Amino acid sequence: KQDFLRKKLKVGKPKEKARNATDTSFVSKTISIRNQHLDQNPHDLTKRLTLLKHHNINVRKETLTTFQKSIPSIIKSRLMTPLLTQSIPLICDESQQVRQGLIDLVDEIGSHDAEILKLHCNIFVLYINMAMTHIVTQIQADSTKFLSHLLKYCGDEVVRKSWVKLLNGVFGVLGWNAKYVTIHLNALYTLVEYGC
Amino acid sequence: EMFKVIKTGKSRSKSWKRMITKHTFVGEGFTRRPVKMERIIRPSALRQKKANVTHPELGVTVFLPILAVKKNPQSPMYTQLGVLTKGTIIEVNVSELGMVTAGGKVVWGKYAQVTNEPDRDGCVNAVLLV
Amino acid sequence: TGKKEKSRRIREGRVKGENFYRDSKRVKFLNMYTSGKEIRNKKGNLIRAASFQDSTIPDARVQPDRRWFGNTRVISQDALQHFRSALGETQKDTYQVLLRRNKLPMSLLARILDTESYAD
Amino acid sequence: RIWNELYKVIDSSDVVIHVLDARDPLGTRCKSVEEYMKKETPHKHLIYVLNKCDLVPTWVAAAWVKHLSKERPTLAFHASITNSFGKGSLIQLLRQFSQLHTDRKQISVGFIGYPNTGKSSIINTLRKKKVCQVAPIPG
Amino acid sequence: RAAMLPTNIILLQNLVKRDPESYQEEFLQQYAHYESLRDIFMLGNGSSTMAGTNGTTMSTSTSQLIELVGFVSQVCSCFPRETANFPSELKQLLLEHHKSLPFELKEKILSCLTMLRNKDVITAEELIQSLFPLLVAYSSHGNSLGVNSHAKELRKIIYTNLISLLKSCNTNGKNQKLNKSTQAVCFNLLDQPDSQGIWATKLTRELWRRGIWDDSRTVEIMTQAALHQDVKIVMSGVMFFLDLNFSAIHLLRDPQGFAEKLFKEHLSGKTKNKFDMEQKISLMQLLSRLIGTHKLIVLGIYTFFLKYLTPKQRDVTRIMSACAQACHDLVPPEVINVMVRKIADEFVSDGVANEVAAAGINTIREICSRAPLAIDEILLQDLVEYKGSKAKGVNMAAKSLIALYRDVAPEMLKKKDRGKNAAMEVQEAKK
RNA sequence: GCGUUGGAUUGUUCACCCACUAAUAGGGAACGUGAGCUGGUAGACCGUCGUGAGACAGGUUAGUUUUACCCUACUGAU
RNA sequence: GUGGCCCCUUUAGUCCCUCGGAAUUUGAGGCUAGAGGAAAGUUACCACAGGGUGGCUUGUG
RNA sequence: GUGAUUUCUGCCCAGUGCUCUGAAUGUCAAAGUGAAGAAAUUCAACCAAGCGCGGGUAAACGGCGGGAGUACUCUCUUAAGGUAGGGAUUAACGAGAUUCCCACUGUCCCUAUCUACUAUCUAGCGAAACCACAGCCAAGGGAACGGGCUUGGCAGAAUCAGCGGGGAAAGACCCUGUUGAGCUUGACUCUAGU
RNA sequence: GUCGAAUUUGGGUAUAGGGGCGAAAGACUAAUCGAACCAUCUAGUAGCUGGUUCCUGCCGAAGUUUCCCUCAGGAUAGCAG
Ligand SMILES: Nc1nc2c(ncn2[C@@H]2O[C@H](COP(=O)(O)OP(=O)(O)OP(=O)(O)O)[C@@H](O)[C@H]2O)c(=O)[nH]1
Ligand SMILES: [Mg+2]
């Protein structure tokens, strides 16, 4: 318990700094804030793109409605294929409201630009035949609406690629109740038509 | 005579808390501890930053900022608490005096010994150790 | 049998109150809230004073040393001025922040009455 | 009595948030405390939080945040247990300060400002339940 | 409960494990969903870019596949039909994409393969061909530099899973067919000179420590690693042969040539100057501890030490403690005399400090304990000068040298030091 | 010797504010342990802590001692 | 000149004692000589039994 | 467990618990098996569950970030993002806690008056608490404090109605038992049940 | 405060003490409840308090001196008969 002391001479190690040498070395980190996006920018829909994954349901519905309204000014741009990539998996969504909003969006984008549907037809049919085999019946029922609205616009390359997956998925979901059966039967009519 | 007992609770039955009655030096980045975790209380009024240091030569005194407490002769716990009792030895800045060693290195810290009991006087008066 | 402090200490590898919970270090901390207390006998008189209340007047000496009277804190002019410049740059910017701030030296940062005397 | 609590809170705090009303921040600023924190306590951080941003348009909030980010970080905020704004940004900033103060073992954040600015509501928003009493009356 | 049963897997599997003749349709209702899910997976904060993610939120498709994989892997043994291609689907899901799968799904498949191998559905000979190629791929430096690639965690998972596999296989009897096969891949990794033998060395050390790979074939792998060009592989080999050394030295094929090749390649030959001092010292330790133990002769060691035998040098107490460890009864004492006269000139000279002199004498007497006739009486006397030295380091040191030569060559000492029995033994034996 | 006020303020008052006034002086006899009348344990909630029972750095709320007819003193009365 | 300056573990017994109806052989106990060295908190929901001026000050660091 | 409706409901199975018809190996009781010995006995092997090990679960207790390159250090993502600038202007009920306004008044300045039953006096009836002895003051000693002691001021019967200063003259709080009980917990020893 | 109902109530009946019942206050369970009441074991017991009955004569004290895991109930030196 001394007021002054040495460790030791400590042969082999670096010598030491004596007792009073001042050390003028430091480091200064710089704080980083979020941006918070308070000022309108042209790149604003690119931020609403990812709200299709929002845990809330009204958020996703209103986002799909906004993208529906903003179609003609973005139909030819760098945002449409990511829009469809991020919105197609809502076929297996838990809400009739969101599925209906997506039906409306695909109708609008089909009336405007159908080459994008022709380009994205594969993941479309994959998610449709996933919904056809979904253990949830709310999702298993609303498959054929997406299918019919798809055939309405692209129609024949979908069957030129995948015919049997479609047919066996429909015959599965049919079980082979009031209006879902009618929708399945209309889809069957349109499918067999595009098979002619 | 140094620590006062402080009691906590509605029915005050727990004491466990100790207030230092005398003047103190805490440092530059003090930042009080939470109440559930603080035991030693060093109140803001009994907290000194500057002393009144006299050079025995030159017949001159200066109001210098304190840098540290190295040795309070009573129970070196008190050194870590930073208690400025009589006879306490402190490091004070001396850059105002323009002292320089052989080599041209400016001196900015020196030892001083307090000569008063600042629990009785708000002043902390000290003498430089040349 | 498995729920015994003996078996626990065996399978893993002293103070009153060491359990599956509350190791050595924790028991001492939690005893702080209680036993800042004053011990007495049955008739009433102090055996053991409360903590930080020992009540003994120590021998308060300070020995001579050649290490007093010496320069304890030294700095060269070039390092000093560079240190001034960098921190004058740093501490004007509020988004910046120094990391340690305690190991660092921050301390390094006519009159006519002589002629006329109120009376002339 | 109140200013004793103020200085107690500051001395116990490692960070000080300064809550302003977006209707009148310069009215609700309290510059003397910032000057005291400059001279006395440079080791504290002293950031701004605009609150009640839901009452004013977005461009006014952006303007004030731009005007005040020149000097102090200045987050914008809206306090509600249900529908909030700025919660994650403030969380991120506080854990930044925590990462800087890695040796202290804990970091205390005081809430300073005028009455009726939303300090209790900001705390209740961070915790996401009613922790502090709240009322439209000031005190 | 009925409508929720398809959503609750934990109850479904406990029901299926009881009566699996029932719950066939319940299993097909989920296998179809799993098929449709895998058929899919087969194929910033700036004002402009899309917002990023935190790293812990996932997709509802992935959250379903992660559950279905476990269900199917736990009831495949009850439904051998309709599941025969399931592990092959997992394998070609892993080792043909590597990147379009999230980390949680990869981890889940990696654990389901391990339990499918614990059960005898899958064999080690085809699980190894799944696990090893992913190590090299996630140690790529191009796969590990995405945004949220979990490359380090995956490289740890695959490594500990391989360890569990081989520990599993070597319990009853040592599966030589497996060990001899997965040592060949270590050999064929150490050939690739970039860094890929890391996953051979780090693994062989673990298996040696677990006692699973006590064999002559394995020590050759670490020999080749020590003889390698990459620093972190050479160090793995050296630290293996260190851990005072371990029993692996008693399974070497030629320790003398090993030490010769080491001293020639790394330290002296090209003087490439790749190793830092902290690694050079660990190489010196290995060389000296092999040499002293097995009676080797190199003779270049003893001039290589002399550059570093100076008290103004970085951490010399380790170097001089290995100097003694390379001394024998069977080497020419002149090449050690030069060493002792360097130490004596530079450590027990005029003006030197107490610790310095004590270190010198202590590292000389433990040399002379192995090579007694390596310093002569004239300097022995100069060093036993320091007996009564008042410092308590040099005295304790000199007494050790005196007690060392009191039992070995007491005639070199003077009459003052021969302690009551050496002198009596000399008086009878001098006539 | 004689007087030395009326009020506002409990997000509080170990005090201050504006008026009137000739003036708006300071104190004691209680507070040198504890003594008229009035504001400022049991139940419950939030916060900190605790594995927990519970405790508190806190905060809020509600919440039953009841003389004199005895001696003395004092005030009046035979 | 007969040196120096200040209490629970274990082993062994020639021809040691005993195992009580006699003996032998294993074990056990002695007496010898050796070598080693049971247990945490809380209670304001509580209860019981006890206990508890040196004439001091004033305006001037 | 939460506590109408409405609105919101993001992430973590590192930890502690719970759970899994979860391989082998490890730990591993009794019975049973083998070896030695003349035998009592000694040793070894085998050895269920449980543990350990690794999978699931957070409207379970906890808890609050992720990844990569060489615990540290650099880097960049942070999806508890307000869906919109219409984002919060938000019932009824209550012997619940609180502030302000109108009205109204003896709450107050500033007290006065009246009625009934008492008190009061009388006939009859007739207790209780408390009680070492008793009962005028001042100063001193004194445990800060005398009705009794010392020194002084004084002191005249027996008494009625009132008063509440004192005496009546009958509290909390603090501490201690190696106490009594209640409660809790991987504190110790046990135990029903399984 | 409430007053047509989760309403108020009589009689009969069921639940019994480490047990019951509880729209939960540790509330109620015959003026008794953080474990009812009666008798016995039982003159239960610590610790501490209170008290302990006739006269005279003669002698006549004591307070760290040394220790058992610190208080502690003690064991002892010395003093007196
Ligand atoms: N619209 C809106 N109102 C807010 C916001 N924050 C607070 N308020 C409202 O402001 C009122 C008063 O502010 P407080 O929450 O009490 O803020 P405070 O005065 O600092 O709180 P205290 O510390 O308790 O005094 C509250 O009753 C809220 O209703 C906000 O972000 N937006
Ligand atoms: Mg307020």
Distances (CA, A) of D66 to A47, C67, D51, D73, E46: 21, 56, 15, 10, 17
Q: Which two tokens stand for residue B8?
A: 């906590």
Give which of A65, A144, A145, A60 is closest to A105, Cα–Cα.
Answer: A65
Residue E268 (CA) to nucleotide H87 (C1'), in angstroms, measures 75
Which position has the token pair 């490289």?
A: E155
Q: Report the interhelical angle of E301-308 vs E334-347 (nearest 10°).
A: 10
Residue-wise DSSP of chain A? --SS------TTS-----SSB------EEE-----TT-S--STTHHHHGGGGG-S-HHHHHHHHHHHHHT-TTTSSSSSHHHHHHHHGGGGG-S-HHHHHHHHHHHHHHHHH-SHHHHHSHHHHHHHHHHHHT-S-HHHHHTHHHHHHHHHTTS-HHHHHH-SHHHHHHHHHHTT---SHHHHHHHHHHHHHHHT-
Annotated binding site of D for GTP: 113-120
Q: Which residue, E285, E301, E304, is CA-closest to E293?
A: E285
Closest among E20, E112, E10 to E70, alpha carbons compared = E112
H/E stretch holding E393 reads none
Pairing of strands B50-55, B60-71: antiparallel
For residue D62, the enclosing domain spans: 1-139
| Strand stretches in E64-157, DSSP E | none
Domain count, chain D: 1
> Are the C-beta atoms of C82 and A31 separated by less than 8 Å?
no
Distance of CA D136 to the CA centre of its chain: 18
- From the centroid of its chain, how far is CA E153? 19
Nucleic acid strand G within 7 Å of C17 CB: yes
Q: CA-CA distance, E113 to E87, in Å (whole number)?
A: 7
- Closest C-alpha residue for ligand 1 atom 26: D136
Query: How many contiguous H segments (helices) and E segments (strands) does chain E have?
Result: 20, 0
Task: Round to whole Å and give the CA distance between B8 and B39.
Answer: 11
* Rounded Cα–Cα distance for residues E59 and C25 (Å): 44
List the D130 CA – H4 C1' distance (angstroms). 20
Distance D65 CA to ligand 1 centre (A): 20
Residues of A within 8 A of D61 (CB-CB) are: 38
Which residues make beta-bridge pairs with D50? Answer: D20, D76
- Interhelix angle D87-100/D119-127, rounded to 10 degrees, is 90
The secondary structure of residue C45, as a DSSP letter, is -
Q: Do chains C and A touch (3 or more CB pairs under 8 A)?
A: yes
d(CA D48, CA D112): 10
Decide: E379 and E387 in contact? Cβ < 8 Å. no
- Mutate which of B32, B33, B49 to disrupt the D interface (most D C-beta within 10 Å)? B32
CATH of the domain at D50: 3.40.50.300
What is the rounded CA–CA span in Å between residue E418 and residue A5?
Answer: 41
DSSP labels for B33-45? --TTT--EE--TT
Measured CA to CA, the distance from residue D94 to residue D100 in angstroms comes to 10
CB-based contacts of A27: which residues, under 8 Å, 6+ apart?
A: C99
Buried b / exposed e across E136-174, counting CB within 10 Å, b at 16+?
ebbbeeebeeeeebbbeebbebbbebbeebbeebbeeee
d(CA C79, nearest CA chain B) in Å = 10
**Span between the terminal Cα atoms of chain E, in Å:** 109
Residue D51 CA, closest ligand 1 atom number? 31
Q: How far apart are CA E160 and CA E206, in angstroms?
A: 10
By C-alpha to C1' distance, H80 is nearest to D88
How would you classify the pairing of strands B40-41 and B17-20?
A: parallel
Euclidean distance between CA atoms D17 and D39, whole angstroms: 18
| Nearest-angstrom CA–CA distance, B43 and B24 | 9
Q: What is the torsion angle, in degrees rounded to the nearest 10, for the CA atoms of residue B46, residue B47, residue B49 and residue B50?
A: 10
Residue with the nearest Cα to atom 21 of ligand 1? D120
Distances (CA, A) of E381 to D74, D119, E378, E385: 80, 84, 5, 6
* Nucleotides in chain F with any atom closer than 7 Å to protein CB: 11-14, 46-51, 55-59
Distance CA C9, CA D53 (A): 58
CA distances from C49 to B7, B40, C45, C55, C56 (A): 16, 18, 10, 8, 10
**Burial (CB count within 10 angstroms: exposed 0-12, middle 13-18, buried 19+), residue C105:** buried
Q: Tell me the three-class secondary structure of B90-113, residue by residue.
A: EEECCHHHCCECCCCCEEEEEEEE
Query: Cβ neighbours of residue B69 under 8 Å, at least 6 residues apart?
Result: B25, B79, B82, B83, B84, B88, B89, B90, B91
Compute the nearest-CA separation of A19 from chain B (Å). Answer: 12
User: How many Å apart are CA E405 and CA E418, to the nearest integer?
Assistant: 9
Closest CA to E226 of E170, E171, E285: E285
The DSSP H or E segment spanning E217 is helix E216-226
- Using the structure block, give the residue that is written with the tokens 């009897």: E173
> Distance (Å, rounded) from C-alpha D113 to C-alpha D97?
21
Q: Report yes or no: E335 and E303 within 8 Å, Cβ to Cβ.
A: yes
One-letter amino acid of A34: R
CB atoms within 10 A of CB B102: 5
Cβ pair E101, E93 in contact under 8 A = yes
Q: After which residues is chain C broken (C to N over 2.5 A)?
A: 13, 109
Sheet holding B40-41, edge to edge: B3-6, B17-20, B40-41
**Burial tier of A40 (Cβ tally within 10 Å: 0-12, 13-18, 19+):** exposed
Contacts of B86 (CB under 8 A, 6+ apart): B114, B115, B116, B117
Query: Within 10 A of C59 (CB to CB), how many other CB atoms are there?
Result: 6
Cα distance between residue C46 and residue A180, in whole Å: 90
Query: Rounded CA gap, A163 and A168, in Å?
Result: 9
D65–A contact, CB cutoff 8 A: yes
| Chain C, nearest residue to D104 by Cα | C100
Closest alpha carbon to A150 in A118, A196, A112: A118
Instruction: Record the tokens describing residue C110, joined without a space.
Output: 């006519």
Residues 25-44 of chain E: which lie with beta carbon within 7 Å of strand H?
A: 44
> In terms of C-beta density within 10 A (0-12 exposed, 13-18 middle, 19 or more buried), how is residue C4 classed?
exposed
Q: How far is CA E400 from the centre of its chain?
A: 37
What's the farthest any 2 CA atoms get from each other in chain E?
Answer: 111
Of E187, E194, E166, E94, whose CA–CA distance to E134 is shortest?
Answer: E94
The alpha carbon of residue D97 and the mean position of all alpha carbons in its chain are separated, in whole angstroms, by 14
Q: Residue C52: exposed, middle, or buried by beta-carbon count in 10 A (0-12, 13-18, 19+)? A: middle
* Cβ atoms within 10 Å of B36's Cβ, excluding its own: 7
Measured CA to CA, the distance from residue E179 to residue E214 in angstroms comes to 11
Which residues from A are below 8 Å from E314, CB to CB? 12, 14
Asked whether the CA dihedral A86, A131, A124, A91 is positive or negative, the reply is negative
CB of residue D86 inside a 6 A radius of ligand 1: no
Determine the distance separating the centroid of ligand 1 and the alpha carbon of E193, expressed in angstroms. 66
CA B53, B55, B58, B59 torsion: positive or negative? Answer: positive
For chain C, the first-to-last Cα distance in angstroms comes to 103
Nearest Cα to Cα of residue B118 among B56, B49, B55, B61: B49
Breaks (C-N over 2.5 A) in chain B follow: none
Give the number of other Cβ atoms within 10 Å of residue A85's Cβ. Answer: 12
Q: Which segments within B1-130 are labelled E, that is strand? A: 3-6, 17-20, 40-41, 50-55, 60-71, 89-92, 106-114, 125-128
Best mutation site among D30, D75, D121 for ligand 1 pocket (most ligand atoms within 8 Å of CB): D121
- C101 in Cβ contact with A39 (< 8 Å): no
The angle, 0 to 180 degrees and rounded to 10, between the axes of the packed helices E231-242 and E198-209 is 10
Secondary structure of E19-63 in the HEC alphabet?
Answer: CCCCCHHHHHHHHHHHHHHHHHHHCCCCCCCCCCCCCCCCCHHHH
Strands B125-128 and B40-41: unpaired
What interhelical angle do E103-118 and E60-75 show, nearest 10? 0
Phi and psi dihedrals of E21, rounded to 5? -65, -40
D45–C contact, CB cutoff 8 A = yes
- List % helix, strand, coil for chain D (3-state, nearest 5): 40, 15, 45
Q: How far is the CA of A78 from the centre of ligand 1 (A)?
A: 43
Chains B and E physically touch (3 or more Cβ atom pairs below 8 Å): no
* Distance from C-alpha of A191 to C-alpha of E306, rounded to nearest angstrom: 90
* Cα–Cα distance measured from residue E282 to residue E238, given in angstroms and rounded to the nearest whole number: 8
Using CB atoms within 10 Å of the CB of residue E18, give its burial: 0 to 12 exposed, 13 to 18 middle, 19+ buried: exposed
Q: Where are the alpha helices (DSSP H) in E295-376?
A: 301-308, 316-323, 334-347, 354-368
Report the alpha-carbon distance of residue A83 to residue A64 in Å, rounded: 10
Q: How far is the CA of D121 from the centre of ligand 1 (A)?
A: 5
Helix axes E316-323, E301-308, angle to 10 degrees: 160
Ligand 2 (ion): residues with CB under 5 Å are: D 115-116, 138
And the tokens for D113?
A: 């400002």
- Pocket probe mutation, ligand 1, options D49, D80, D124, D134, max atoms within 8 Å of Cβ: D134
H/E segment holding residue D17: strand D15-21
Token couple for E389 = 């030295």
Residues of A in contact with E317 (CB under 8 A): 11-12
Query: Rounded to an integer, what distance in angstroms lies between the CA atom of residue E376 and that of residue E390?
Result: 26
Q: What are phi and psi of B50, to 5 degrees?
A: -130, 145
Nearest chain C Cα to D44, which residue?
A: C97
Contact list in D for residue A39 (CB cut-off 8 A) is: 58-59, 62
- Is strand F within 7 Å of residue B44 (CB)? no
Could you tell me which residues are beta bridge partners of residue D16?
D110
Relative to the alpha carbon of D116, which ligand is closest? Answer: 1
Task: Give the alpha-carbon dihedral of C83, C85, C89, C94, to 10 degrees.
Answer: 50
B98 Cβ neighbours under 8 A, 6+ residues apart: B106
The closest alpha carbon to A18, from B73, B103, C78, B99, belongs to B103
**Shortest Cα distance, chain A CAs vs residue E184, angstroms:** 43
**Nearest to A117, CA basis, from A153, A92, A68:** A153
Q: Resolution of this PDB entry, in A?
A: 3.0
Angle between helices E24-42 and E86-94 (to 10 degrees): 20
* C-alpha separations of A182 from A72, A94, A174, A185 in Å: 33, 22, 10, 5
- What is the Cα–Cα distance from A169 to A183, expressed in whole angstroms? 14
CA A191 to chain centre: 27
Q: Please, what's the b/e burial string for E335-365 (b: 16 or more CB within 10 A of its CB; e: otherwise)?
A: ebbebbebbbebbbeeeeebbbbbbbbbbbb
Dihedral class, residue B82 (left if φ above 0, else alpha if ψ from -120 to 50, else beta): left
What is the SS3 assignment for D52? Answer: coil
Neighbours of chain C (3+ CB pairs under 8 A): A, B, D
Exposed, middle or buried by CB within 10 Å (0-12, 13-18, 19+), for E374? buried
Residue of the nearest CA to atom 19 in ligand 1?
D116
- β-partners of residue A94 are none
User: Considering only CA atoms, which of E28, E76, E226, E54 is closest in space to residue E147?
Assistant: E54
Q: The tokens 């001092």 sit on which residue?
A: E277
Size of interface A-E (CB pairs under 8 A): 73
CB of D53 lies under 7 Å from some atom of strand H: yes
**Which residues have C-beta within 8 Å of that of residue E192, sequence separation ≥ 6?**
none
The number of CA neighbours under 13 Å toward the Cβ of C109 is 17
| CB within 8 Å: D93 and A38 | no
Calpha distance D77→D21 (Å, rounded): 10
For chain E, which chains pass the contact test of at least 3 CB pairs under 8 Å? Answer: A
Separation of alpha carbons E426 and A52, rounded Å: 100
Please give the Cα distance from C102 to C85 (Å, whole number): 19
Smallest Cα–Cα separation from B52: which of B60, B40, B41, B42?
B60
| Ligand 1 atom with the shortest distance to the CA of D115 | 19
> What CA–CA distance (Å, rounded) separates E212 from E174?
8
SS3 assignment, position D120: helix
CB contact at 8 A, D60 and D22: yes
